[PDB]
C-alpha cells in the first residue's frame, strides 16, 4: 500500500504561452540552499526558487538569440573547478548551450548533431560528461571541460530512427537509449575502450597540439531489443539493474535483458531474450513526448497525462497495481503534463504543461 500524499499549493503561467517541455530541479544544490528548478519551452529557459506557503519565486529568464529555437530538454551540472552551477539546454536547432544560471549568459555551445536534440543527461559521477540524444539517430558523449566529443553511439547497429531518450545507470557504468525504431539499446561506458576514450578527452590540450581530437565511433551496442513495446519508445530510465520504459500503450514497462536470473554485467551483446517483470498502468497518455520521472532515492515514480492528471507510484511496493498513490488532480490543470521533477529531498513535485503552466505539489 502507498502512503504518499500531496497537495497543490500553487500554479503559474509563463508569459510566452508556449508549451513547456522540460523541468528539472537542481539536485546539486547543497542541503540548506533554496530549491531551484529550471523550465524550458519555446526559445525560453526560466529559473525559479521554491519558498514557503507554496511561493514560486521567478529568478531569471534566458531568451535565446534565435527566435526559431524550440528547447526540448535541460540538465544541471557544476563546474568541477569553481563548484559554480551550470545548466545545459538544447532542442530543435540540435545545438547544446551551457548557460551560467546566475548571469543567464550562454558560456559555450556544441554543434555537431545533424538534427534536433531530445534529451540531455549529465553523468552521475563526473559533472563534465554530457550525453545528448538526437533525431539524427545517434547519441553523443561530450567532455565539457576539454570541449571534446568523446564518442558517437550510432552507425551499423545503432538506432535506425530518431532517439527519444536515454539514461545513465546509478553508478554511470552504462546507458540505455530508446527511440522511434521501437528499440532499447544498451551502451556500456565502463568498457576498456570507453574508459580510455574518456581518459584521452581529458589529456587533450589544444595549446599543446594542432591535431583535432578524435572521437570514438561506437557502432555496436552491448544489448538490443525491440521485444518490449510495439511502437516508439519515448522514455527510458534505469531502476537499479532493471529498466522502466514507455510507449503509447498507457503502461510503463518494467523489464530486464536476458532471462530472469541473468546478471546485467554478464549479458552478451548477442542476447536475444528479455524478461518483463511488471507494468505501471495509467490512462490518457497515448500521445508522443511524455516523460516519466523518479525522485533521488527512487522510492517514487511520477508521470503526467494528456489531460493534466499526475500519476504517482510508490516503488517500495512490489506489486505495481498496489503501488499506485492517489492521482494528483486539480480542476484548473487540464493541459498535457509533459514532464515533472521532484526536489532532491522529494518534498516538492513540479509539473509543467502545454498551456505554459507550472504546478507545484507539496508532499504532506
Amino acid at each position: 500500500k502507498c502512503k504518499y500524499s500531496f497537495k497543490c499549493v500553487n500554479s503559474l503561467k509563463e508569459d510566452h504561452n508556449q508549451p513547456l517541455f522540460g523541468v528539472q530541479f537542481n539536485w546539486h544544490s547543497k542541503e540548506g540552499d533554496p530549491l531551484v528548478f529550471a523550465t524550458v519551452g519555446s526559445n525560453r529557459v526560466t529559473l525559479y526558487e521554491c519558498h514557503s506557503q507554496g511561493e514560486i519565486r521567478l529568478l531569471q529568464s534566458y531568451v535565446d538569440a534565435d527566435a526559431d529555437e524550440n528547447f526540448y530538454t535541460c540538465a544541471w551540472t557544476y563546474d568541477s573547478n569553481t563548484s559554480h552551477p551550470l545548466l545545459a539546454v538544447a532542442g530543435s536547432r540540435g545545438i547544446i548551450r551551457i548557460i551560467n544560471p546566475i548571469t543567464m549568459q550562454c558560456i559555450k555551445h556544441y554543434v555537431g548533431h545533424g538534427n534536433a536534440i531530445n534529451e540531455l543527461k549529465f553523468h552521475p559521477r563526473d559533472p563534465n560528461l554530457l550525453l545528448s540524444v538526437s533525431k539524427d539517430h545517434a547519441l553523443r558523449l561530450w567532455n565539457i571541460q576539454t570541449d571534446t566529443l568523446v564518442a558517437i553511439f550510432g552507425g551499423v547497429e545503432g538506432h535506425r530512427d530518431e532517439v527519444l531518450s536515454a539514461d545513465y545507470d546509478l553508478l554511470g557504468e552504462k546507458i540505455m537509449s530508446c527511440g522511434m525504431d521501437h528499440s532499447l539499446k544498451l551502451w556500456r561506458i565502463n568498457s576498456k575502450r570507453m574508459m580510455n576514450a574518456i581518459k584521452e578527452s581529458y589529456d587533450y590540450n589544444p595549446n599543446k597540439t594542432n591535431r583535432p581530437f578524435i572521437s570514438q565511433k561506437i557502432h555496436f551496442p552491448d544489448f538490443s531489443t525491440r521485444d518490449i513495446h510495439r511502437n516508439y519508445v519515448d522514455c527510458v530510465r534505469w531502476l537499479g539493474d532493471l529498466i522502466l520504459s514507455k510507449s503509447c500503450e498507457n503502461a510503463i514497462v518494467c523489464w530486464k535483458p536476458g532471462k530472469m536470473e541473468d546478471d546485467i554485467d554478464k549479458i552478451k551483446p548477442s542476447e536475444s531474450n528479455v524478461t518483463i517483470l511488471g507494468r505501471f498502468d495509467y490512462s490518457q497518455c497515448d500521445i508522443w513526448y511524455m516523460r516519466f520521472s523518479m525522485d533521488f532515492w527512487q522510492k517514487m515514480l511520477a508521470l503526467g497525462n494528456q489531460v493534466g492528471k499526475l500519476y504517482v507510484w510508490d516503488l517500495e511496493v512490489e506489486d505495481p497495481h498496489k503501488a499506485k498513490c492517489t492521482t494528483l488532480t486539480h480542476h484548473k490543470c487540464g493541459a498535457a503534463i509533459r514532464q515533472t521533477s521532484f526536489s532532491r529531498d522529494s518534498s516538492i513535485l513540479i509539473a509543467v504543461c502545454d498551456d505554459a503552466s507550472i504546478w507545484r505539489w507539496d508532499r504532506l
Partner: peptide, 29 residues
Amino acid sequence: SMFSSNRQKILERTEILNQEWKQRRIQPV
C-alpha cells in the same frame, strides 16, 4: 526476492551518490 535484491542495489548505489553530494559545496543560484 528479485525485488528485495534490486532495492538493496538502489539503496547501496544512491548511498554512494549521496555521500559524494554531501562532500561538495555547490554555489547558490
